[PDB]
Structure 1
Amino acid sequence: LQDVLTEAAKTTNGLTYIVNSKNELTQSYAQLQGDAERVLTGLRALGLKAGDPVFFQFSSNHAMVTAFWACVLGGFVPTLVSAAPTYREMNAAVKKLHHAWKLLEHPLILTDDSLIEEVQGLAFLWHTDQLRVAAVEPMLTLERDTAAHPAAPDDSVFFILTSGSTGMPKCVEHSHRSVLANVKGTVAANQFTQEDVSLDWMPLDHIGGIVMFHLVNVYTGCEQIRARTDDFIAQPLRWLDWMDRYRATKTWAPNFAFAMINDYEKEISSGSWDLSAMTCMINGAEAVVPKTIHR
């Protein structure tokens, strides 16, 4: 993966983070490798060694992206799981979290400034004192670190769990080659290029968040656009506002997102957008319904 970041930084395309209808945030691939090495100074400080599992709980697309690569450099193994709606009380979610937190040898948890106050509550709820959390945001004010640990092609790259599991959650090991094995075949079947603009709001803890989309954008040097999943579900006609403000060519969303759009038939037929930009719209097969598509 270290080779894909250094190669991506060699273009002036990068990452674009959406805050509202009129706000934006730019992170060039070069800004990323540089910002990633500032976090790596903080990560090594807390006492991380190569190959150590790491636990991710994020809401800000920016901080999570920087942390994912900051761990690729240092040679760490991050764990990709969705954030809990609430940590105040035990529930179905916080239960799966205790299982994972204990299954992965009680690792460190990596959060933003927003969730740290809420996540630290797990110390009292889980009655364990061997839990600790870290804020990514204040680590971008540190020193860099070019000393990147040597990678292997079959070393484990990240952990991703079956959040959509009725039973106890299961953990998945992925290797640098097993991941890149797909991102290369994918770019082939679909014919992707540095030109495409990739709009994505699905969370990163899902397989489509990293492998199928993010990593394919850094591997081919696309311009990237990331928006919060909350902002979309709160009003799905923001999906059109984004594909027009960025003239995007590539986006994806499971079928449940398509149906959500049709319900705004009143708005669609009164106030037009421009969507010729689009050329590649992918969706989850687990819920295929031609009924709503042709509509």
Structure 2
Amino acid sequence: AFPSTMMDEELNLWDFLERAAALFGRKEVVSRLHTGEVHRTTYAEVYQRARRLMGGLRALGVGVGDRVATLGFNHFRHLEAYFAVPGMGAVLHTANPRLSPKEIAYILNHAEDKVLLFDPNLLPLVEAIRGELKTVQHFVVMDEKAPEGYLAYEEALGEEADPVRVPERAACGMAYTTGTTGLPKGVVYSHRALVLHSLAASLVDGTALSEKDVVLPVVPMFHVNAWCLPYAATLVGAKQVLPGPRLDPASLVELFDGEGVTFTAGVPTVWLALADYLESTGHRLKTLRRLVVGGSAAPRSLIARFERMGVEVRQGYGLTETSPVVVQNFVKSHLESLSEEEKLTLKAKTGLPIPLVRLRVADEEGRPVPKDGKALGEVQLKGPWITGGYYGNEEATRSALTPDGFFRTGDIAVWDEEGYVEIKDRLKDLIKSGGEWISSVDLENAAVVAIPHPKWQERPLAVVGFAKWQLPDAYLKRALREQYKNYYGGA
């Protein structure tokens, strides 16, 4: 009825790196490779090489809408792909190398990826599944060199190409979740979604990302695009430190101090191992100020450990389906007067719903449950970076949403008058161990319950195909969980 005079300028992920190259071109991107060697590059060079990757991928037959898959850890070549693939209007499919060969083959075949980029230390896995892949036309090793039948990344680079412009709602990337019963389910992100997510999650009450920050994502670049951190860090022009596959405490500490890391993010298991190490050696990190924990619930103790060592811990919550961040923990101004015990309890809560997210905790018919911090309901979400369904799966799509169009997370929670959310349970019958999913059912038909664990956070226990980490440690369900609550003895 009344048009605005505003320009119809589309949101695009390439604009982050373009701005980084122009304003913060000398800012460093530091990578530790699988061999332990440390590689140094900058935003200016990443931008140049990302343009070369766009031209190289075009020469390999990649066009707008085509899927280019990755199987790799956090390093500069993965960051170059993060921009080049969406930059040419293609779809960045981050695949998880920790999954079974059968699961990876299914996901790559379902997405119909045209090109696969993968780390050299993952060649045995690629050689193992290669014969099962039906769409992959080119296999690119993310390294200087590649063996027979394989193409090296440095060889695959072509002439510099200009980025391709698309409507912001077009696909930029995709990822499959294994936190579900049956087959993996695909979620397709858009430029619009990930740009908005990068902005809204990086505010002061969120990750508070600044140009002066040095950012180390411990979360894998195959876990919801490392929680969108590589994009958000580029947007502000922060120095990035990409740790690679080595996530042992001594390796991380070396990077924390050596590179002057100020901000980091990862799953609870990595931080528990890090805290164990810092406490045993009496070593205190010389620059680290902020740490976010996500993927699973952070134990109250984990927060108390780091706060004692001078590290601020902020819980984050989300799903593959939500890009991922929908909830972030910070202490409200008027709640700073709470006692140290009360404040620790508050920090141990999941947190507050972030900007541009409509969150509710509701029952079976979509009715919100009372805000008393006691009543249980399902977390339900609506927003521009929240999925409205799945790719190529009609039954998963129609069971994903409520009648009034809210996405159903499958997580049971409470919420209070202050607006704080607390994940308490899960509708979905699954085990999450060290930030990776195990299906109870698949182990059964071959009763399996999730039992709390100190180090990881849940471990399979059976009652009387698969990888060694999936194996149940020891040999109506709301009873066996409460009965064997302390089998693995974890607080």
Q: Give yes or no for TM over 0.5.
A: yes
User: Which runs of 5 or more residues in structure 2 are unaligned?
Assistant: 1-12, 144-151, 306-491
Deviates more, 1:46-55 or 1:277-286: 277-286
**Alpha-carbon shift at residue 179 of structure 1 (Å):** 1.1
Q: Say if 2:276 is the partner of 1:260.
A: no
**Alpha-carbon shift at residue 8 of structure 1 (Å):** 0.7
**Alpha-carbon shift at residue 130 of structure 1 (Å):** 4.7
**Alpha-carbon shift at residue 216 of structure 1 (Å):** 0.9
Aligned to 1:197: 214
**Alpha-carbon shift at residue 114 of structure 1 (Å):** 4.6
- Measured at CA, do residues 283 and 267 of structure 1 come closer, stay the same or move farther in structure 2, by a change above 3 Å? same
Q: Which has the higher helix share?
A: 1
**Alpha-carbon shift at residue 145 of structure 1 (Å):** 2.5
Residue number among 34, 40, 62 corresponding to 2:76 in the alignment: 62
Deviations 1:244-265 (A, max 9, x none): 1122110012222222234436
**Alpha-carbon shift at residue 3 of structure 1 (Å):** 1.1
Aligned to 2:191: 176
Distance 2:124 2:137 in 1: 12
- Count of residues in Structure 1 that have an aligned counterpart in Structure 2: 279
Aligned to 1:104: 111
CA contact (8 A) 2:62 2:114 kept: no
Aligned to 2:172: 157
**Aligned pairs (5 A) from 1:110-121:** 110-116=117-123, 118-121=125-128
**Alpha-carbon shift at residue 45 of structure 1 (Å):** 1.1
CA contact (8 A) 2:170 2:190 kept: yes
Higher alpha-carbon Rg = 2
CA contact (8 A) 2:171 2:191 kept: yes
Distance 2:36 2:69 in 1: 33
Counterpart code for 2:221: L
Aligned to 1:140: 154
Residue number among 231, 239, 258 corresponding to 1:215 in the alignment: 231
Backbone CA RMSD of aligned residues: 2.6
Q: Say if 2:280 is the partner of 1:278.
A: no
Partner of 2:53: helix, strand, or coil?
helix
**Alpha-carbon shift at residue 119 of structure 1 (Å):** 1.2
- Measured at CA, do residues 31 and 261 of structure 1 come closer, stay the same or move farther in structure 2, by a change above 3 Å? same
Distance 1:7 1:200 in 2: 21
**Alpha-carbon shift at residue 29 of structure 1 (Å):** 0.9
Deviates more, 1:202-211 or 1:18-27: 18-27
Instruction: Give the alignment's TM-score, normalised by structure 1.
Output: 0.84
Q: Say if 2:249 is the partner of 1:236.
A: yes
CA contact (8 A) 1:42 1:139 kept: no
Partner of 1:159: helix, strand, or coil?
strand
Distance 1:21 1:236 in 2: 16
Aligned to 2:260: 247
**Alpha-carbon shift at residue 104 of structure 1 (Å):** 1.7
- Measured at CA, do residues 195 and 171 of structure 1 come closer, stay the same or move farther in structure 2, by a change above 3 Å? same
**Alpha-carbon shift at residue 36 of structure 1 (Å):** 1.1
**Alpha-carbon shift at residue 286 of structure 1 (Å):** 2.7
Residue number among 97, 111, 122 corresponding to 1:83 in the alignment: 97
CA contact (8 A) 1:37 1:146 kept: yes
Distance 1:241 1:266 in 2: 16
Q: Say if 2:37 is the partner of 1:32.
A: no
**Alpha-carbon shift at residue 266 of structure 1 (Å):** 6.8
Distance 2:257 2:57 in 1: 38
Partner of 2:162: helix, strand, or coil?
coil
Aligned to 2:18: 6
**Alpha-carbon shift at residue 117 of structure 1 (Å):** 5.8
CA contact (8 A) 2:75 2:244 kept: yes
CA contact (8 A) 1:40 1:71 kept: yes
- Measured at CA, do residues 289 and 114 of structure 1 come closer, stay the same or move farther in structure 2, by a change above 3 Å? closer
**Alpha-carbon shift at residue 182 of structure 1 (Å):** 1.4
CA contact (8 A) 2:116 2:139 kept: yes
**Alpha-carbon shift at residue 15 of structure 1 (Å):** 0.9
- Measured at CA, do residues 63 and 165 of structure 1 come closer, stay the same or move farther in structure 2, by a change above 3 Å? farther
Instruction: Give the alignment's TM-score, normalised by structure 2.
Output: 0.52
Aligned to 1:187: 202
Distance 1:224 1:265 in 2: 23
Partner of 2:168: helix, strand, or coil?
coil
**Alpha-carbon shift at residue 159 of structure 1 (Å):** 0.1
Distance 1:107 1:22 in 2: 31
Counterpart code for 2:197: N
Relative contact order (C-alpha < 8 Å, sep 6+): which is higher? 1
CA contact (8 A) 1:14 1:221 kept: no
- Measured at CA, do residues 226 and 69 of structure 1 come closer, stay the same or move farther in structure 2, by a change above 3 Å? same
- Measured at CA, do residues 112 and 194 of structure 1 come closer, stay the same or move farther in structure 2, by a change above 3 Å? same
Distance 2:51 2:112 in 1: 26
Aligned to 1:87: none
Identity of aligned residues (%): 20
- Measured at CA, do residues 165 and 133 of structure 1 come closer, stay the same or move farther in structure 2, by a change above 3 Å? farther
